[PDB]
Design a binder for this molecule. Structure first.
Ligand SMILES: Nc1ncnc2c1ncn2[C@@H]1O[C@H](COP(=O)(O)OP(=O)(O)OP(=O)(O)O)[C@@H](O)[C@H]1O
Ligand SMILES: [Mg+2]
Lengths: 50, 1144
C-alpha cells in the first residue's frame, strides 16, 4: 500500500514532460525576441529536445 | 568701465536679461574678474553645474571649482566613496577664507546641510607654506581644539608654541610636526620624532582630514547611540544599523544618518561662506528647490517602510525651501536669465542675440554658404570656439575652403574690430553679442539638424480594384488579399478564445494549410482580389520561407583555409622585417603632448613595442590588458614611431562608432605633426571614399582608420608599415589576415582586452609576443556589479542615481525590432531623463548625430544594442544597465562592464536577468563568475578562463574557439619550416600573387583539392602553386597525369579546379578580364583591348534578346538555366570557343 507501479505510460510521459519543459523555455525566448508579427509556430518550436 | 554695477548689500538682486546660450559663461567670467572676493555660482542642477565648470574655465583663469557632492541619491544605500570626502572636506576648510575664485554648487548640494563648524576647525589641519598666519592664532585655535601645551609632544591632542617654532601632535596621525612661523607666516613642515625631536622630512603642505564625514571615535559612537535611543527604537538584529555601528562597522549608506553624531544642528552650508560673496544664479531656484524637495519627500515616504534601517525626516538632513529662501535673502545676488526683463534699477538687458541660420550640408555644391555669406556682412570680430585641440585642424581645413584663417586667442577680450579668431574651450552654443558687436560661433552651430526620413509617396492604396467595403457577402473559397501577407482563401466565420475573451474571426487558408484568423473588429485590413484570377489565384506562405531557405546554403566547404593560412605565414616568416628609426627628442615631444603619466606597466608595454619595432624582424604582438587601462595610447606611441618614418599606419576597428571615436582621438593626439589622418567606413559617402582611396594609393594619407571596409581589396596602400588591430576579439581570422596577406613583412600590433581563445593560446605558445597591462592608471575604481531579476523599481532607482549625479547611462537592450518600444516604455517610466536610441541599423546620418549628441551631454540615457561593446569611451557615462544579461558571453559581459568607470567616479553596472525559472544553468554560472571577478586586472584571468573551457580552435584554420581536433603546434612549426625552406629556395610567388593577376573566374562553385585527397598541406600547396602558375594547357595536362598517378582518381572539386585554371589560361589570352557564373546566369567582363567580335556581339544581342544584355562598357550579362554545374562549365567553355573562332 506504500509501493506503487509506474509502467510504460507514466515513465515515458515523464520524459515527454521533461522534453516539453525545454521546448517551452525555447518558445518563451523565441517569443520575447524581436519581430513577432511574422513568426509562425513551426519556425518557433524545436522538435529536438522532445 | 563696464556695462552694469554689481550689487553689494544684504540681499539685493540684479536681474540680467537676454543672455542666450554660452553667455552665462562669459558673464560669470566677467563678474568673477571684476569682484574683490569670492563668487558662488548656484547652478540649477548638477548636470548644468558640470557643464558650467568647463565653460567658465574657458573664458577666464580664476580657480573655478565645484563642491564634490555625495553622488548618492536621497536616503540611498551606497557610501560616498571616501576619496570624494577627502575633496568634500578640504573645500569646506578653505571656504571660510577663499579670497578670489568661483565655487560652483548645484541646488542639490546647496540645500544640503554640512558638518557644523567645530568638527572642522577641531578635527583637521590643512596648511600650505603660503599661509600667512601668526603663532598665537594657531595657539588659540588649538586651544579651542582642546590640545594641551606640552613642550615634549608625544600623544594625541598636544601642541606647543616655543620661541619661533610650533609643535603639534595631531588627533589624526601619530607623528608630531614642527612648524616654524616667521613674520606672520608659516615656514616649515618638519616631521620630527615622537621623542627624539629630529626632523625626518621637510614638507610644504600638510593635510590631516578625517576620512569620514562624521566623528567616528568612541565618544561620538556613544553620542550616536544616545540620539538613536532618543529618536528611533532599537531592535535586536545583527543587521540593524544601531548594532552595526555599535559593533564598530559602518553600514553602507551611513552618511544619511549624519545629524545624530553631532548633537548640534547641522549648519545650512551658508555659515561656511565668506564675509562678502556674490551669489550668481543660473536659470531659476524657486523652481528647482521645490522639485528637489518633492523628490526628497517621495524618497522619504518610499523608504519610510522597512522598520529595519529607519530614516530621519528630510528637515533633519536638508534645508526646507522656506529656509533656503530665508537665507538667499542674506547674500547679494545676481541672476542670469535668458529673457527680456522690462525696465528698472536692479535690472538690466545685455543685447545677446542668437546666431543667424548657420548650418552646412554636402547637398549644395557650395556647402559653406551660410558662413560665407555671414562672415562678409559682419563688421565685428568673430570667435570660433572650437571644442578640442585636434578639432581646430578639423576646423582649420574647412575654413581654408573659403579663405578664412583664424588666429588663436586665449582670452575672449583679445578680439579686434575686424578679425576671425578661434579659441579652445568647451562652449556649446553661439551668440551674437550685439553690445560690443562680437560673435561666438560654437562648433554646434555648424551642424544644425538632420531632417531625413521624409519618405516616399504612397504606402497604401484606397478603393482601387477591390474596395473591400465588405459587408460580408464573400463566398467560401473566394481568394482574398491580406495587406501584410498576400493572397489567401477566405474559409468562413469562426469563434475563438484568446485568453479571456471570446471573439468572432475570419478564417483564411494560406499555403500548407496554415490558417490565419483575423478579428471582425479589424476586417478593413482585408481587401478583395484584383488580378482577375479568382480561380487562378496563387497562395503565399505565412511568415515567409526565411527559415526554410536558410538551410539551402552551404556544406561544400567552398574554400580550403589551411593552404591559404599556411602560405600567408610562410611568406611572413621568410621576408626580413623593417627596422624603424627612432629619434629621441622628436619622439620626446610626442610624449610631452600626453596629458597624463604612463603607469609603470604601460610604459613597459610601450618600451617593449618600440624595442621590437626597431628590430630587423617583423613584430606580432598582443597587448592584452584590462579594459580602460590605456591600451590605446600604446597604439599612438607606436603609430608615431611608424609614421615618423613615412610609413602609413593602418588602424583596423570592428565597428563604425569605434572608428569615429578613434578618428577623433587620433586627430586630437596628432594635432600638430604633419600626418593626415582619415577614416573610411560606411559613414563616409561614396564621393569621400573614392577620394580617400586615391589619396592612400598616391601615399598622402598617413593613418587610415577603418572598419572592415578597409580590407576590401580596393584599398591599396603605398608603403604600409604598421597594422593596429583594435578589439580583435572579433574579425574572425580572414579579416585579420587579409591585410597581412598583401604585405607580408608588415608589423602588427594587436590590441585587445579579452583575446579570443585562438589568439590567446597562440600568444601563450610563443607564436606571437604578449605584453600584459596591469596597474590601473590613476583613480579607477573597480566597477560594482549587481545581478538582479529585472525590476522597474531597480531600473528607475539606478537611472535616477546616475542622472541626479549628472553622468549618463548606457541602457543596453540588444534587440533592434523592439528597441523603439523599449525606449518608449523607458521614457514613460522615467520622465526625468532624456532618452535616445542608438543601434547600427539606422540611416547612419542619424547614428552620427545620436552618438555625437551623446558625447555632448545633450541627452542622458542611451538605449543601445551591443554596438557599444567595443570601446566607446564617453568618460561621463557611469552606469550600464544590461537588459537581458543571461545570453552574453563572459568576454562580452566584461567588455560591456568596462564601458563604465573610465574616470574617478565610482560606476555601477547592473546585469538584469529574467526571473530564474527560465535561465539555463550555464547562464547562472556565467553571471556568478562575472559578478565574482569585480576587480581590476580581471580581464586576462577571464580570457584564460574562457580559453581552457572553450578551447583554442584550429591553429591553421578558421574557427577561433573550439576543441575540434586542430593540428598540433609541434607539427605546425615543422610544417611551416618546410614551407619556408621550399618557398625561399624555389622563390615562387605567394598564392595571393596567383590570386592578384588571376583573371577572376569566380563562378561560385567549389574548386579546391580536398583534404583527404592530398593530406599533406605543404604538398597540396605546392600543387596549388604549380597549377595556378601553369601557363600552357600541356603543362596543365602534365599536372593532371602526374596527379592522377600520384593520387589516383580526381575528385570533382579537383577536376573543376583544373578546368577553371584552364579557362583562366584561355580568357587571359582572350581579353576576358572577369568572368562569372551562378544558378541563373552570370556576367562576362571584357578588357579594353579584347578579342570579341562586336558584330557577333550585336548578333548575340538581337537573335537572343532573352539571353544577352550589355550593361556597361565591358559587362555582358548572360542568363541561362545553369541548374547543373557541369552544364554551367560546358556552357562557359563553349561560349568562349564560339568567341575564339570569331576572335579578331
Ligand atoms: N597612464 C594613464 N594615466 C591616466 N589616465 C590614462 C593613462 N593612460 C590612459 N589614460 C586614460 O584612460 C582612458 C582609457 O582609454 P583608452 O582608449 O586610452 O584605453 P582603453 O579604453 O582601454 O582602450 P579601448 O578604447 O581599446 O578600450 C583614456 O581616456 C586615457 O586618456
Ligand atoms: Mg582601442
Amino acid at each position: 500500500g506504500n509501493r506503487r507501479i509506474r509502467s510504460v505510460g507514466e515513465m515515458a510521459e515523464n520524459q515527454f514532460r521533461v522534453g516539453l519543459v525545454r521546448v517551452e523555455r525555447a518558445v518563451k525566448e523565441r517569443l520575447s525576441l524581436g519581430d513577432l508579427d511574422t513568426l509562425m509556430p513551426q519556425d518557433m518550436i524545436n522538435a529536438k529536445p522532445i | 568701465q563696464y556695462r552694469y554695477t554689481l550689487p553689494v548689500k544684504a540681499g539685493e538682486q540684479r536681474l540680467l536679461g537676454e543672455l542666450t546660450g554660452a553667455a552665462c559663461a562669459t558673464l560669470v567670467a566677467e563678474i568673477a574678474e571684476r569682484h574683490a572676493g569670492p563668487v558662488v555660482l548656484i547652478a540649477p542642477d548638477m548636470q548644468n553645474a558640470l557643464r558650467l565648470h568647463d565653460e567658465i574655465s574657458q573664458f577666464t583663469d580664476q580657480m573655478v571649482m565645484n563642491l564634490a557632492d555625495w553622488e548618492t541619491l536621497p536616503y540611498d544605500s551606497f557610501s560616498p566613496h571616501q576619496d570624494i570626502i577627502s575633496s568634500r572636506l578640504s573645500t569646506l576648510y578653505q571656504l571660510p577664507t577663499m579670497q578670489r575664485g568661483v565655487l560652483i554648487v548645484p541646488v542639490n548640494t546647496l540645500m544640503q546641510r554640512v558638518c557644523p563648524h567645530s568638527f572642522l576647525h577641531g578635527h583637521a589641519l590643512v596648511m600650505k607654506k603660503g599661509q600667512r598666519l601668526s603663532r598665537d592664532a594657531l595657539r588659540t585655535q588649538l586651544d579651542s581644539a582642546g590640545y594641551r601645551h606640552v613642550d615634549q609632544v608625544m600623544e594625541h591632542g598636544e601642541y606647543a608654541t616655543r620661541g619661533a617654532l610650533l609643535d603639534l601632535f595631531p588627533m589624526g596621525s601619530e607623528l608630531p610636526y614642527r612648524l616654524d612661523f616667521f613674520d606672520d607666516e608659516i615656514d616649515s613642515l618638519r616631521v620630527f620624532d615622537v621623542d627624539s625631536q629630529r626632523t625626518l622630512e621637510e614638507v610644504e603642505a600638510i593635510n590631516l582630514l578625517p576620512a569620514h564625514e562624521f566623528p567616528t571615535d568612541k565618544a561620538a559612537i556613544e553620542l550616536f547611540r544616545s540620539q538613536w535611543r532618543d529618536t528611533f527604537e532599537v531592535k535586536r538584529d545583527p543587521e540593524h544599523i544601531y548594532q552595526q555601528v555599535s559593533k564598530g562597522t559602518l553600514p553602507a549608506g551611513i552618511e544619511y544618518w549624519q545629524p545624530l553624531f553631532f548633537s548640534e544642528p547641522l549648519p545650512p552650508l551658508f555659515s561656511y561662506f565668506p564675509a562678502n560673496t556674490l551669489l550668481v544664479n543660473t536659470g531659476d531656484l524657486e523652481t528647482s528647490a521645490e522639485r528637489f524637495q518633492a523628490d526628497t519627500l517621495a524618497r522619504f515616504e518610499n523608504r519610510g517602510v522597512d522598520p529595519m534601517r529607519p530614516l530621519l525626516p528630510p528637515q533633519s538632513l536638508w534645508l526646507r525651501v522656506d529656509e533656503l529662501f530665508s537665507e538667499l535673502k542674506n547674500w547679494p545676488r545676481v541672476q542670469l536669465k535668458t529673457e527680456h526683463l522690462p525696465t528698472k534699477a536692479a535690472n538690466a538687458n545685455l543685447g545677446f542675440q542668437k546666431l543667424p541660420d548657420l548650418a552646412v550640408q554636402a547637398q549644395q555644391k557650395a556647402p559653406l554658404d551660410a558662413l560665407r555669406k555671414f562672415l562678409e556682412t559682419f563688421d565685428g570680430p568673430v570667435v570660433f570656439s572650437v571644442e578640442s585641440e585636434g578639432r581646430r585642424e578639423a576646423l582649420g581645413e574647412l575654413l581654408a575652403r573659403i579663405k578664412i584663417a583664424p588666429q588663436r586667442i586665449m582670452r575672449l577680450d583679445e578680439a579686434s574690430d575686424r578679425g576671425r579668431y578661434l579659441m579652445i574651450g568647451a562652449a556649446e552654443h553661439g551668440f551674437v553679442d550685439t553690445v560690443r558687436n562680437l560673435a561666438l560661433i560654437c562648433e554646434s552651430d555648424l551642424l544644425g539638424e538632420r531632417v531625413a526620413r521624409r519618405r516616399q509617396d504612397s504606402r497604401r492604396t484606397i478603393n482601387p480594384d477591390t474596395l473591400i467595403r465588405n459587408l460580408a457577402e464573400l463566398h467560401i473559397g473566394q481568394p482574398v488579399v491580406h495587406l501584410e501577407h498576400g493572397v489567401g482563401r477566405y474559409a468562413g466565420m469562426t469563434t475563438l478564445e484568446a485568453g479571456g475573451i471570446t471573439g468572432e474571426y475570419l478564417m483564411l487558408t494560406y499555403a500548407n494549410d496554415a490558417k490565419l484568423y483575423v478579428p471582425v473588429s479589424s476586417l478593413h485590413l482585408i481587401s478583395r482580389y484584383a488580378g482577375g484570377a479568382e480561380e487562378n489565384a496563387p497562395l503565399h506562405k505565412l511568415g515567409g520561407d526565411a527559415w526554410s531557405r536558410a538551410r539551402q546554403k552551404a556544406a561544400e566547404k567552398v574554400r580550403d583555409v589551411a593552404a591559404e593560412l599556411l602560405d600567408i605565414y610562410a611568406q611572413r616568416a621568410a621576408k626580413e622585417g623593417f627596422a624603424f628609426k627612432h629619434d629621441r627628442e622628436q619622439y620626446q615631444l610626442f610624449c610631452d603632448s600626453f596629458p597624463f603619466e604612463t603607469t609603470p606597466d604601460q610604459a613597459q608595454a610601450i618600451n617593449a613595442v618600440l624595442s621590437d619595432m626597431c628590430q630587423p624582424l617583423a613584430m606580432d604582438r598582443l597587448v592584452c590588458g584590462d579594459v580602460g587601462f590605456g591600451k590605446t595610447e600604446v597604439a599612438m606611441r607606436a603609430a608615431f614611431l611608424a609614421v615618423d618614418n613615412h610609413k602609413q599606419v593602418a588602424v583596423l576597428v570592428p565597428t563604425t562608432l569605434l572608428a569615429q571615436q578613434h578618428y577623433d582621438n587620433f586627430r586630437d593626439r596628432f594635432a600638430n605633426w604633419p600626418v593626415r589622418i582619415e577614416m573610411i567606413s560606411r559613414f563616409r559617402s561614396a564621393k569621400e571614399q573614392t577620394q580617400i582611396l586615391a589619396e592612400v594609393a598616391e601615399g598622402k594619407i598617413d593613418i587610415l582608420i577603418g572598419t572592415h571596409k578597409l580590407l576590401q581589396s580596393d584599398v591599396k596602400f603605398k608603403d604600409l608599415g604598421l597594422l593596429i588591430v583594435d578589439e580583435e576579439h572579433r574579425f574572425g581570422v580572414r579579416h585579420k589576415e587579409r591585410i597581412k596577406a598583401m604585405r607580408a613583412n608588415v608589423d602588427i600590433l594587436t590590441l585587445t582586452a579579452t583575446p579570443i581563445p585562438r589568439t590567446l593560446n597562440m600568444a601563450m605558445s610563443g607564436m606571437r609576443d604578449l605584453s600584459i597591462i596591469a596597474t590601473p592608471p590613476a583613480r579607477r575604481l573597480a566597477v560594482k556589479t549587481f545581478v538582479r531579476e529585472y525590476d522597474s523599481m531597480v531600473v528607475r532607482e539606478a537611472i535616477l542615481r546616475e542622472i541626479l549625479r549628472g553622468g549618463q547611462v548606457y541602457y543596453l537592450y540588444n534587440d533592434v525590432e523592439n528597441i523603439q518600444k523599449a525606449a518608449e516604455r523607458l521614457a514613460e517610466l522615467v520622465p526625468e531623463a532624456r532618452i535616445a536610441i542608438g543601434h547600427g541599423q539606422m540611416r547612419e546620418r542619424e547614428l552620427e548625430r545620436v552618438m555625437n549628441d551623446f558625447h555632448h551631454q545633450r541627452f542622458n540615457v542611451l538605449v543601445c544594442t551591443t554596438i557599444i561593446e567595443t570601446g566607446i569611451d564617453i568618460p561621463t557615462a557611469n552606469t550600464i544597465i544590461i537588459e537581458r544579461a543571461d545570453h552574453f558571453g563572459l568576454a562580452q559581459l566584461h567588455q560591456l562592464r568596462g564601458r563604465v568607470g573610465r574616470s574617478h567616479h565610482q560606476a555601477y553596472a547592473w546585469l538584469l536577468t529574467p526571473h530564474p525559472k527560465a535561465m539555463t544553468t550555464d547562464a547562472q554560472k556565467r553571471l556568478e563568475a562575472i559578478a565574482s571577478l569585480e576587480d581590476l586586472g580581471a580581464g586576462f584571468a577571464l580570457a584564460t578562463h574562457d580559453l581552457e573551457i572553450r578551447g583554442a580552435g584550429e591553429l591553421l584554420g578558421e574557427e577561433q574557439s573550439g576543441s575540434m581536433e586542430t593540428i598540433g603546434f609541434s607539427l605546425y612549426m615543422e610544417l611551416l619550416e618546410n614551407a619556408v625552406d621550399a618557398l625561399k629556395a624555389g622563390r615562387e610567388p605567394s598564392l595571393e600573387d596567383l590570386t592578384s593577376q588571376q583573371t577572376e573566374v569566380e563562378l561560385r562553385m567549389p574548386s579546391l583539392l580536398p583534404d583527404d585527397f592530398i593530406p599533406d598541406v605543404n604538398t597540396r600547396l605546392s600543387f596549388y602553386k604549380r597549377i595556378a602558375s601553369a601557363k600552357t594547357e600541356n603543362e596543365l595536362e602534365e599536372i593532371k597525369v602526374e596527379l592522377i598517378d600520384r593520387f589516383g582518381l580526381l575528385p570533382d572539386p579537383a577536376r573543376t579546379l583544373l578546368d577553371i585554371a584552364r579557362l583562366r589560361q584561355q580568357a587571359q589570352k582572350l581579353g576576358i578580364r572577369k568572368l562569372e557564373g551562378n544558378e541563373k546566369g552570370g556576367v562576362i567582363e571584357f578588357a579594353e583591348k579584347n578579342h570579341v567580335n562586336p558584330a557577333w556581339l550585336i548578333g548575340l544581342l538581337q537573335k537572343q534578346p532573352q539571353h544577352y544584355r550589355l550593361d556597361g562598357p565591358t559587362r555582358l550579362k548572360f542568363i541561362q538555366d545553369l541548374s547543373e554545374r557541369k552544364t554551367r562549365i560546358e556552357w562557359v567553355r563553349q561560349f568562349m570557343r564560339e568567341l575564339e573562332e570569331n576572335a579578331i
